[PDB]
Amino acid sequence: VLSEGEWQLVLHVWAKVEADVAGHGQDILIRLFKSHPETLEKFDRFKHLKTEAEMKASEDLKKHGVTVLTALGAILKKKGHHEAELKPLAQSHATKHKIPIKYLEFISEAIIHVLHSRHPGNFGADAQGAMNKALELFRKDIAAKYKELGY
């Protein structure tokens, strides 16, 4: 459980991500794909991208950055009450996309790395801790549906 004060730190920094969703989504996905190349292989649509320059130039990648960050933003704003949201995501990612829970930890590290990089002043260690917690909660809840489904 996050405290109300923890949620405010989380949503304060996300309100800022929301100032440039597409720039954030880009940076986060490139970070993910470069740090953890196995992740890129799960996207048929992105497997042709070899270089960082190619990734940065991809409009479709940028579009997908917006897609994931938008879903995440909607989840965070439920402040833990995200049951309706997690259901379809867990179902598709376990069964259709075949995404290990571990990869959700990877995208969380990438999110933190970039948020750190773009809002030093609203992402001190306190806000970083709060964001860690929110992302962990999400992972925990997803993992529970994975185990239910036999992943």
UniProtKB/Swiss-Prot annotation:
It catalyses: Fe(III)-heme b-[protein] + nitric oxide + H2O = Fe(II)-heme b-[protein] + nitrite + 2 H(+); H2O2 + AH2 = A + 2 H2O. Pfam families: Globin (PF00042). O2 binds at H64. Nitrite binds at H64. The keyword Glycoprotein does not apply. It is found in: Cytoplasm, Sarcoplasm. Coiled coil: none annotated. One of its GO terms (biological process) is removal of superoxide radicals. Heme b binds at H93. One of its GO terms (cellular component) is sarcoplasm. The modification Phosphoserine is found at S3. InterPro entries: Globin, Globin-like_sf, Myoglobin. One of its GO terms (molecular function) is metal ion binding. Residues 1-147 form the Globin domain. Gene3D superfamilies: 6.10.140.2100, 6.10.140.2110. The keyword Heme applies. Its main location: cytoplasm. Its EC number is 1.7.-.-, 1.11.1.-. Monomeric heme protein which primary function is to store oxygen and facilitate its diffusion within muscle tissues. Reversibly binds oxygen through a pentacoordinated heme iron and enables its timely and efficient release as needed during periods of heightened demand. Depending on the oxidative conditions of tissues and cells, and in addition to its ability to bind oxygen, it also has a nitrite reductase activity whereby it regulates the production of bioactive nitric oxide. Monomeric. Belongs to the globin family. This is Myoglobin.
